[PDB]
Amino acid sequence: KKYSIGLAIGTNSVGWAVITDEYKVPSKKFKVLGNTDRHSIKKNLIGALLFDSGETAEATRLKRTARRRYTRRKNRICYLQEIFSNEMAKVDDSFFHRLEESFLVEEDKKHERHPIFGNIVDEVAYHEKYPTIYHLRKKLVDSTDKADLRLIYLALAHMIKFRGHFLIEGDLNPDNSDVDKLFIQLVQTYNQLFEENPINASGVDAKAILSARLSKSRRLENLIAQLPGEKKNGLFGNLIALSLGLTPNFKSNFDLAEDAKLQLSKDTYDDDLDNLLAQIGDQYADLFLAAKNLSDAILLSDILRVNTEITKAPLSASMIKRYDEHHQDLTLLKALVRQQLPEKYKEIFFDQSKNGYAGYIDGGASQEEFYKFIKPILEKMDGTEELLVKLNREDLLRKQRTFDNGSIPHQIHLGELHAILRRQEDFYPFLKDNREKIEKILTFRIPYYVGPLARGNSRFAWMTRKSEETITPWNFEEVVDKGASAQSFIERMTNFDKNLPNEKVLPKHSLLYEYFTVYNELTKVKYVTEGMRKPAFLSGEQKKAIVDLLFKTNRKVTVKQLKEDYFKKIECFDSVEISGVEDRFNASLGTYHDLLKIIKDKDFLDNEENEDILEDIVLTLTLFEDREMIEERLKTYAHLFDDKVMKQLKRRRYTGWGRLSRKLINGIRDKQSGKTILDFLKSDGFANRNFMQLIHDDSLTFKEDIQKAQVSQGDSLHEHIANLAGSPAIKKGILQTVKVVDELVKVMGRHKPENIVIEMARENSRERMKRIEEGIKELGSQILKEHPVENTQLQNEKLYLYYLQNGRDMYVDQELDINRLSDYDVDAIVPQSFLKDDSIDNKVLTRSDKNRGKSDNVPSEEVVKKMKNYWRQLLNAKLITQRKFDNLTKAERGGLSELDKAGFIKRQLVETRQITKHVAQILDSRMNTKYDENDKLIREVKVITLKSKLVSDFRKDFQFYKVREINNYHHAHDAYLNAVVGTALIKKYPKLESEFVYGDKATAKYFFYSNIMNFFKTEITLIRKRPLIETNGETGEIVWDKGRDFATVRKVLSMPQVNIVKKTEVQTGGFSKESILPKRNSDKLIARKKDWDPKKYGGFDSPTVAYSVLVVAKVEKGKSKKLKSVKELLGITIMERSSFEKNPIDFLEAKGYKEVKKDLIIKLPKYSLFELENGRKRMLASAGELQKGNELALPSKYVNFLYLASHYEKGSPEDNEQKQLFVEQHKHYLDEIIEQISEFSKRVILADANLDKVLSAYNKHRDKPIREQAENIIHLFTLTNLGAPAAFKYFDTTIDRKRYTSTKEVLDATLIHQSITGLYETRIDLSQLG
RNA sequence: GAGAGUCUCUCAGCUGGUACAGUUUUAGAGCUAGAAAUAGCAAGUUAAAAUAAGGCUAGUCCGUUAUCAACUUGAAAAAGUG
DNA sequence: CAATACCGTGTACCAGCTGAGAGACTCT
DNA sequence: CACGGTATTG
Ligand SMILES: [K+]
Ligand SMILES: [K+]
Ligand SMILES: [K+]
Ligand SMILES: [K+]
Ligand SMILES: [K+]
Ligand SMILES: [K+]
Ligand SMILES: [K+]
Ligand SMILES: [K+]
Ligand SMILES: [K+]
Ligand SMILES: [K+]
Ligand SMILES: [K+]
Ligand SMILES: [K+]
Ligand SMILES: [Mg+2]
Ligand SMILES: [Mg+2]
């Protein structure tokens, strides 16, 4: 028996079908195991496996790292307490015990309830003196008196526990950067460089203007207004803007050709500045560094809002300023509300449920919600002007612990810590001896290139130790091998050379690698002149001269430079034609020029004797990121360079790795020639062979040595699937598809199919907001100031396009109107009739698509000439990608050629994604295993890959319409159709095997691939007809009988029995919801620690059931404890699972059950299937809830009527009228549809209230247009859909979900265990238990 | 058809180092009039601790990804069964 | 046992490696 | 998000 398999691989479904030679789906009797009446069952060989989406590893990672975070912060606190141990025991022998048990209720505390001092008087006195921890911090920093050791510990521990970020390197002092003085020094430098045009900065209060709580451009405008005759876009204005963090363009200032866009926040700035300094000289360096100092001062003034000369604790002083202004403004507001609005005082200051001050301090209202609740109250009253100013400033009634404290560097807390230590070490010797230890506890963080400090039990760790002892912050450098660990951090992730699998790949910025790339590109260049008969290669001498003259003096080498600076200067050619390179050479010797600028010794770089050294240098600069370690490694070359050069080298860092090893490039040599690959690239006679030719040339030993260098352990199926590149969800689909195919082959008597057809489906507002913000601030536009928008709003396609286009038409140089977006047009850059791309990367917002030009191509040349500069501005602002820009500008490059259109249609039909090829390879290597007499693979099974458009057009052309919302059958159906089309297609044109089977003029191919599917049609327009029977031309075998086979497909799509199977899965992941709920009298609360009784301490609820368990046992009853037989579902929770599996009997007996029938324990994962009466089916949602378990097999006529009537997705107007006439002639179908649903709901769904409401809603809108009634009947199928119940809407009526909140009935129903395909079953009558 | 290097991007996956909030219990003596229910008023900004229960391998480590119908033999990994 | 309604930890930064989609140059 | 847990009302 011959058959083929159709597969439909999705992210939540794998559809499968089996077809015969006639495109029929077989049906078998399958054995049914179990204890029921039924010994066998009839099954069609079509169905679909359904599963929950596979999840990535990200969330797990973030939780794991948060875990390490909390562990290490606790360890810091433990280090500090161990330092304070003895002297604190001398002063108060229970302080740390009181701190530890602070969380406990006084009933469970072992010591006094007042943490700090242990008696109420002292505690109240403390809090009255220091209402916030910042008061105590400022006191301990500024005062000179001896202080209580407990208060010292509290300050230092608060600093260590919340120590602040590490985004700034080096040290930082409070008065290191004062805005006034740095602005004055910037004015000094500017007037030193520009004596003829000086600025009068007298009377300009730079402090308040730059350190104001305002946007960057607003403070810029403020300071520029204070300087008459100076504009914000002049030189000084741009310097201030760069200080304020904007993106100034110094081009117009210095009359530059290169766009000198400088933004200090960028990683490129260090280069972007130097590049600029290359054009205007080094006299301007002092200026551009004074501006950077000013920027640092402004950044600090953001955080420290107090004078740094009255205290050494500017941060704590600013927190105390927050507290004092909170107190004053709260007193004023209370008085104001007492006087003017005395009825609202209670709602404002007593009601936690409201977003007033009560909800702000005691409830759950945030600063933002509080400001929103209290702004109208302030505007409504009199005397609230300053309060409203502070509110719009986001500085009213501030707390100290807020969301925006993430700005605080750790250097600040460190300064305060160091100050306290210097104060109190005069009174405590142990603080003098352990000052640096405590400072280190604060400053030290495990380096990212070292990872978890494990000892052989972490699967994530790679760190290597210099000595075997406990790692502490004070011996890290001596116990951890920072060098070996930093090296392993990279060498455990970097590729080896595929040609030499034992050799490491070179750094991308290595000098040798760039030499290789340049020579490889340069070897295939060809040139022609007049007297020359034929185009020539460049000789070895010519290539060397072009490298020395051009590539070693210019960063980039254009074609024009090649023509004028070599062929004219050396060869005396006035005209020459070049091939093998266009506009400019892609390769270049960037590292050569970097090192030439740093060391300034060209003869050192050109000397081959230094090659090794240079490589090592670059290696280091690439392998490491810590400048101290780079310095340590380069120390062995300190004698070759000045100290200025060695510092400049330290700062020079590279990222990236190539794809070939040094041994391949310039190591292995050809036996006879004695030359390396690079030696051939430099000079290879008149052949000029490049890398591919070199390693593929049988006359050379490179190919032989590459063959010899190869090595093998083989992955398993699952391991091999896991190591593919792709979403983990699609990978889950791949593995399930393989398992389905294995079962299907086992079904067909271990006979392998003829062909297997596979189709794979295709593949955030915060990201959109970030893109638009960055693009507009880089563009310098004020559209956001004038049109504020939230991230959610950007989910509208037109508004997102409007903003990405700076509010302007993309085809016309004119502004657009937000309030008119509904009148505008979204147009595809390349037409969707060629490239089916609807992404933002191919779409464009324009006033009218007519203005694009002709609709049969790319935007016309006139539009390109008009809009090229605007498009390049959008490109540099990253508001359009380079791909979008190239497509937009293609008309100046000839536009769309006929070859491009042919390729686009081919892409529409021929699958080229790599993940699909990997699926095909897996199935192929699984099925075809034998080799013939020539030791070539015997391809018994042909694996065909199709794209969804083929079967989609098939459905839309032969009226095999699909409606996804009706049921899950469409997946299965898709599979079937694929298997059909696929097979038929390759039977009709066997030459297509090349492009459609795994394994090894433009108008003509356009026409061909556009008409490839016409052999199914009977008549074709653009109007010759076709036979009723389509056969293969050469073999004469029949492939499609247009009078019998369509009937076959219709009968297959009409079959009501389709094996839909929802994959039962144990639940995993978090134990429960994460919210810590307050204490409550409820056994649903779960203790967050072993002794934290939730009735006193609160805790969690809502745990996830890993899997239910059927228990047949006895439970005690009443006060007598009489044993009563029971049969029920106990939900084992994820957190209980290990304990329940280690010993199920003891777990159950501790849960209450006695005399447990151990062998009648049935493990029920989620989606376990139960059948009750009248074919009614339920799936296990949990231990106490059920999901719908039946599919509604709506007949095909109603499906197609719903598709056509609702205008689901056209064709000829005559065919459109015929479809409309069929819809209107079959209007009664509507009622019939309802009837079917009704008969289903009364039989399987059992939601009387919902069904009656839906029937009334349908009988209410019977005067609505047929299209809308059908569109809402589509909604109605949520009532019958398999799975969890959900709420839907019929027109404007809303039907809430009827839930199945009890699982008692399934305990007497028939449990059904299904194989992956649902063909094999085991049925268990549960009524026979108990 | 199957690929390779380079260039210009774009998306994705995987790992590590940190920070700020949030929440929970306790501590920040509420006062007065009332026997009480309650009413009037004062006050509020902070800290400690926990942040998957926990585990043994005891590390400044690990604990939410992937994988899983049923049945026999299996100790388990497996393999086999219509 | 009803319907029935409400609720669900979030944000930010820094460092790195890999594949792959798509346009272009050169090739097996 | 959905869809399972939870309390409320009855
Ligand atoms: K006690
Ligand atoms: K001015
Ligand atoms: K709050
Ligand atoms: K807080
Ligand atoms: K080029
Ligand atoms: K590096
Ligand atoms: K030196
Ligand atoms: K899972
Ligand atoms: K390539
Ligand atoms: K209290
Ligand atoms: K599992
Ligand atoms: K199953
Ligand atoms: Mg812990
Ligand atoms: Mg906190």
Side-chain angles (χ1 to χ4, degrees), chain A residues 38 80 103 147 155 284 288 463 528 533 546 979 1011 1083 1229:
Chain A
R38 202 167 270 283
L80 180 59
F103 181 81
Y284 293 86
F288 278 86
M463 175 271 308
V528 199
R533 163 191 59 89
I546 295 175
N1011 303 126
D1083 44 3
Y1229 274 5

Side-chain angles (χ1 to χ4, degrees), chain A residues 123 171 307 379 437 453 529 536 661 881 921 1038 1310 1323:
Chain A
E123 213 80 358
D171 296 336
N307 194 41
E379 290 171 341
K437 260 195 168 192
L453 314 189
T529 53
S661 58
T881 61
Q921 180 276 334
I1038 310 150
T1310 296
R1323 302 178 96 108

Side-chain angles (χ1 to χ4, degrees), chain A residues 11 150 156 341 364 443 696 718 880 928:
Chain A
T11 66
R150 295 164 282 192
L156 306 188
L341 299 172
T443 60
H696 286 314
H718 174 217
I880 72 171
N928 308 308

Side-chain angles (χ1 to χ4, degrees), chain A residues 580-596:
Chain A
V581 55
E582 315 287 351
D583 201 84
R584 69 132 217 209
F585 283 88
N586 294 334
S588 66
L589 312 159
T591 299
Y592 184 89
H593 287 115
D594 296 340
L595 302 184
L596 182 53

Side-chain angles (χ1 to χ4, degrees), chain A residues 684-695:
Chain A
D684 181 41
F686 39 80
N688 266 26
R689 294 169 289 182
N690 64 6
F691 178 63
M692 283 288 95
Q693 298 175 326
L694 284 177
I695 72 170

Side-chain angles (χ1 to χ4, degrees), chain A residues 117 120-130:
Chain A
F117 295 112
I120 177 151
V121 172
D122 293 355
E123 213 80 358
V124 178
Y126 164 84
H127 277 279
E128 281 272 21
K129 182 164 189 177
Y130 312 103

